[PDB]
Each structure stands twice: as C-alpha cells, then as structure tokens.
Amino acid sequence: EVQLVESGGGLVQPGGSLRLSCAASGFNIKDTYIGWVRRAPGKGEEWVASIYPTNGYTRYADSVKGRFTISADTSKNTAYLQMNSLRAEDTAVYYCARWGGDGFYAMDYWGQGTLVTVS
C-alpha cells in the first residue's frame, strides 16, 4: 500500500528555518503531484505547495510565496519543503499529500504529519 513517510518538523524562533521531507513508499514520486497541506489551530486544511517531479513544475499558496521552496530528489524518491523566514502563524501540523492530474487528493489515508512550531 501507498505510505507517505514524513519528517523534519521542529521548534524554531520567528525568522528561523526548517526542512520537511516526504519519502514515498509504495509508489514513485515521478508518477504524481506531491506536496504539503497544513492544519493550524482553529482552521481547516490549507494547501501550501506542490511539485510535479518529472519536470519540476511547482506552485505555491500566496501565504508562503518567497519564503518556502518545494523540491524533489527522484533518486531518493523523496520531496522536500524548505521553510525560511518562518513566522508564528506558520505553526501547524504539516502533512504530505499526493494529488492527481485533477488537482484532487490521490491517497487513501493521511500520514501522521510533522509539527512545526514557531515561537
């Protein structure tokens, strides 16, 4: 079965950086759009960023443009989210997700997520 193996959360002060990692299990990231959503306190899900590793196409939510960068290493079958210039309002649990070519979720279950705390 497909699994998303997530890591890289942590605790930093505003202005600091983290890098999230999402390693694919049960599929190749070349076959897919992969990226992150986050769940902050009191909110629904917010899409953050996505990449199509085959050609490197990326797209970002306006809320993170210029601060976060999404990337992929196909030889590691892993995607990354570099988060620079973190703000307190970036505190959330971040989840890796797959989307199909229809822009809609393409995995059966959420992974366990990774916590990013900015304070």
Q: For the largest beta sheet, what order do the strands appear in spatially?
A: 2-10-9-4-5-6
Q: What would the CATH topology be?
A: Immunoglobulin-like
Helix content: under 10%
Give, in order, the helices and strands.
EEEEEEEEEE
Task: State which percent range the strand residues make up.
Answer: over 45%
Number of domains as seen in the coordinates: 1
Q: What is the number of helices? A: 0
Q: Judging by the overall fold, what is the CATH architecture?
A: Sandwich
Cα gyration radius (Å):
13 Å
Number of strands: 10
What is the CATH class designation?
A: Mainly Beta
> Helix/strand-derived class?
mainly beta
For the report, how would you describe the main beta sheet? 6 strands, mixed
Report the principal-axis shape: globular
CATH superfamily: Immunoglobulins
How far apart are the first and last residues' alpha carbons, in Å?
37 Å
